[PDB]
Amino acid sequence: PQAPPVLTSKDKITKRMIVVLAMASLETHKISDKYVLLNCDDHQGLLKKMGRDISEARPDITHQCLLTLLDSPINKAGKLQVYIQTSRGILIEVNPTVRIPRTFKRFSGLMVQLLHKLSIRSVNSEEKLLKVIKNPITDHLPTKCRKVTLSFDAPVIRVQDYIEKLDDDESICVFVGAMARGKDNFADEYVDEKVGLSNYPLSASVACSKFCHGAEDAWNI
Amino acid sequence: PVLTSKDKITKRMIVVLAMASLETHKIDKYVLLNCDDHQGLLKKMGRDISEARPDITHQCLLTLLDSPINKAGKLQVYIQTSRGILIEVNPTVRIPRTFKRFSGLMVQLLHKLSIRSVNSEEKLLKVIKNPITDHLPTKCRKVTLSFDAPVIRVQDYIEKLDDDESICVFVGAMARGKDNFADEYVDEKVGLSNYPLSASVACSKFCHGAEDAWNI
Amino acid sequence: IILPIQQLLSAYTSKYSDFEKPRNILNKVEKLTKFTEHIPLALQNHKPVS
Amino acid sequence: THLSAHLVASFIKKLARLTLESPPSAIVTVIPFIYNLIRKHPNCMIMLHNPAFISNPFQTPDQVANLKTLKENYVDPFDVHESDPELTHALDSSLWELASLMEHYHPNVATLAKIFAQPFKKLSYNMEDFLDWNYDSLLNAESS
Numbered sequence: 001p002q003a004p005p006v007l008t009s010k011d012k013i014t015k016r017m018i019v020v021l022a023m024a025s026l027e028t029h030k031i032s033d034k035y036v037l038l039n040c041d042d043h044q045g046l047l048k049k050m051g052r053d054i055s056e057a058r059p060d061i062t063h064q065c066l067l068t069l070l071d072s073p074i075n076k077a078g079k080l081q082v083y084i085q086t087s088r089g090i091l092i093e094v095n096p097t098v099r100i101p102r103t104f105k106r107f108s109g110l111m112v113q114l115l116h117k118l119s120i121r122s123v124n125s126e127e128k129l130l131k132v133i134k135n136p137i138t139d140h141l142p143t144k145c146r147k148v149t150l151s152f153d154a155p156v157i158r159v160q161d162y163i164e165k166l167d168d169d170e171s172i173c174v175f176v177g178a179m180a181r182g183k184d185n186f187a188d189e190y191v192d193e194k195v196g197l198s199n200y201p202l203s204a205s206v207a208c209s210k211f212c213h214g215a216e217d218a219w220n221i
Numbered sequence: 222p223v224l225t226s227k228d229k230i231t232k233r234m235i236v237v238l239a240m241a242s243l244e245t246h247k248i249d250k251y252v253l254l255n256c257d258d259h260q261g262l263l264k265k266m267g268r269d270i271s272e273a274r275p276d277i278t279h280q281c282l283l284t285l286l287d288s289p290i291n292k293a294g295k296l297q298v299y300i301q302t303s304r305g306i307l308i309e310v311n312p313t314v315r316i317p318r319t320f321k322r323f324s325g326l327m328v329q330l331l332h333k334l335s336i337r338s339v340n341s342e343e344k345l346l347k348v349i350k351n352p353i354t355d356h357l358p359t360k361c362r363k364v365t366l367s368f369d370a371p372v373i374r375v376q377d378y379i380e381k382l383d384d385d386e387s388i389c390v391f392v393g394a395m396a397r398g399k400d401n402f403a404d405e406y407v408d409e410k411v412g413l414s415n416y417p418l419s420a421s422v423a424c425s426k427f428c429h430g431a432e433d434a435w436n437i
Numbered sequence: 438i439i440l441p442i443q444q445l446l447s448a449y450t451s452k453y454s455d456f457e458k459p460r461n462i463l464n465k466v467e468k469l470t471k472f473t474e475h476i477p478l479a480l481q482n483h484k485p486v487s
Numbered sequence: 488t489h490l491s492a493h494l495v496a497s498f499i500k501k502l503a504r505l506t507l508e509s510p511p512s513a514i515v516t517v518i519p520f521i522y523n524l525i526r527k528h529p530n531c532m533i534m535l536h537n538p539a540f541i542s543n544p545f546q547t548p549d550q551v552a553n554l555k556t557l558k559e560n561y562v563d564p565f566d567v568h569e570s571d572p573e574l575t576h577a578l579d580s581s582l583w584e585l586a587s588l589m590e591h592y593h594p595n596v597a598t599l600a601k602i603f604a605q606p607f608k609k610l611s612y613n614m615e616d617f618l619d620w621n622y623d624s625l626l627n628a629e630s631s
Contacts, residue, residue: 001483001484001485001486002485002486003485003486003487004485039319039321040319040321040322041317041319041321041322041324042321058318060319060320064280064283064284067280067419067421068284068419068421068422068425071417071418071419071422072416072417072418072422073413073414073415073416073417073418074416075416075417076416076417076485076486076487077416077485078485102276102277102280102419103256103257103274103276104276104320105256105257105258106256106257158433159429159433160433180318198289198432199289199292199432199437200287200288200289200291200292201287202287202288202289203283203287205283205284205421205425206284206287206288206425206428209284209421209422209425209426209429210425210428210429210432212422212426213425213426213429213430214429216413216414216416216426217374217545220545221414221416372544373544374544374545377544377545415484415485416484416485417487438507438584438587474558474559474561475561475562475563475583476537476540476558476561476581477536477537477540477561477581477583478581478583478586479535479536479537480536480604481532481535481536481604481605481606483606
């Protein structure tokens with residue numbers, strides 16, 4: 001057989017979806033040579049002097065969401081792309097062709113290389129996976145898309161029924177922000193609906209994995 | 222309340238992590254196994270450098286901390302390692318959600334093995350040795366996450382499970398290894414899908430399936 | 438494959454009609470035929486890839 | 488290309504019975520013919536697999552009950568005494584005797600059965616090399 005095709009903004013009218021992450025601590029803080037990330041428990045002077053908070057700043061939320069999302073069965077069936085709106089407004093589009101390491105050191109090194117580069121490359125030297133569309137996600141996304149915020153405060157329903165009710169030409173999108181203290185309003189203006197899946201508060205990795213499990217049993221993905 | 226390993230009458234879900242990297246060495250403080258801080262420590266003791274995957278246990282803990290099933294206090298987390306120790310945690314355990322702050326928690330767990338909480342009210346982490354069949358109910362079933370068995374639905378398998386029948390699942394947190402780490406302890410094997418699926422992804426998918434088949 | 442041979446055993450049941458091993462063999466063959474459902478069994482499946 | 492499916496099914500049932508009552512050499516010689524017939528005729532795989540008796544995890548209980556009711560009244564409609572290959576109802580009868588020959592003492596027959604059970608990769612099976620086979624030839628191949 002063969003794997004499914006590239007699931008990105010190029011795959012627009014076909015069967016595809018978008019997983020959207022936002023309100024994470026993802027920037028380039030160079031320690032005074034190279035480029036480093038904003039860590040709470042590691043740097044004490046730097047984090048306190050930056051102006052952020054230990055409870056507020058969270059750089060591993062994106063790494064955890066990528067670890068819980070890139071290995072999804074629907075992602076190996078070719079149905080999801082990744083859209084990331086960073087704290088500095090950076091919008092990143094990721095195809096499911098590769099899988100970032102769950103090691104936050106290695107994932108943070110790759111993220112710092114992307115932050116100092118905005119350019120990733122393949123081993124085969126034929127498919128630069130890290131694309132950057134015109135920001136935000138909805139400026140170059142598929143022509144038929146469904147936008148909804150999966151909130152713990154919105155109407156909690158089963159993920160199988162709502163996804164099965166969706167058409168195969170639309171692109172269901174979910175916005176997740178894993179703030180230790182926050183609210184489901186990071187991409188509220190982008191979402192066209194407000195739905196719930198869990199009855200307890202969960203991070204972006206847990207909500208994303210629940211959505212992936214619902215999508216896997218939706219159209220047998 | 223919180224379902225524990227002492228109550229072996231009501232069915233309590235047990236999630237046992239298998240082959241998680243928790244190795245300690247001497248500097249001269251005791252240092253946990255790191256894959257990007259110590260490089261020559263693995264290459265000179267006699268071990269390999271691919272046996273340092275310590276963030277899998279913390280990832281499974283954080284992925285099963287704020288779960289809807291863990292909010293109900295039904296999921297008890299057991300962990301077995303190549304060192305020969307087992308860890309048991311109730312769903313009400315609270316730890317810092319940063320791996321650098323969880324590095325101190327890991328050092329405390331590898332240096333005391335009984336972590337009384339910061340509130341000093343309950344020891345959340347309990348150290349237990351072999352075996353693990355005495356932590357579940359007497360009427361229990363053991364499921365191993367392996368691709369050898371056919372892929373079956375979580376709601377379909379949980380619907381045929383009895384109310385007193387406890388479920389003890391085994392998740393392989395190792396980046397590389399076999400699924401027969403507890404084959405003598407596992408009863409049957411189950412699957413999630415024919416496409417790829419991770420370990421903490423499988424744990425969160427099982428939590429979602431238990432939420433769908435048990436209203437959690 | 439026990440269709441003719443048990444019939445041959447039935448021929449044994451029509452040969453002397455006094456042996457005891459042939460009746461037991463016929464009863465065992467009947468029990469094996471009744472327990473078996475004789476339905477079907479196939480496979481040959483596939484899927485995608487990484 | 489003018490052969491019908493009923494005659495092909497009757498020939499397949501006759502070959503299955505012949506392989507059920509023969510030595511290992513005849514079964515090894517007739518396995519390649521069955522493989523070539525399965526590769527040439529896609530309807531013969533219907534005699535190999537029955538989709539109406541399959542069960543799925545994502546299915547309703549009514550379909551499983553209907554499948555169980557259909558399988559509870561399962562019979563063999565093939566006639567071995569019927570000389571006409573078209574009149575023989577070996578198309579509606581499954582090729583069960585192929586499963587009885589899978590568990591064999593010889594390893595070549597087991598390898599042929601394992602290759603036949605999996606999907607077909609190439610259409611040319613090269614049956615000329617495995618045509619002249621006997622007990623002495625198999626013993627010489629195993630000993631050398």
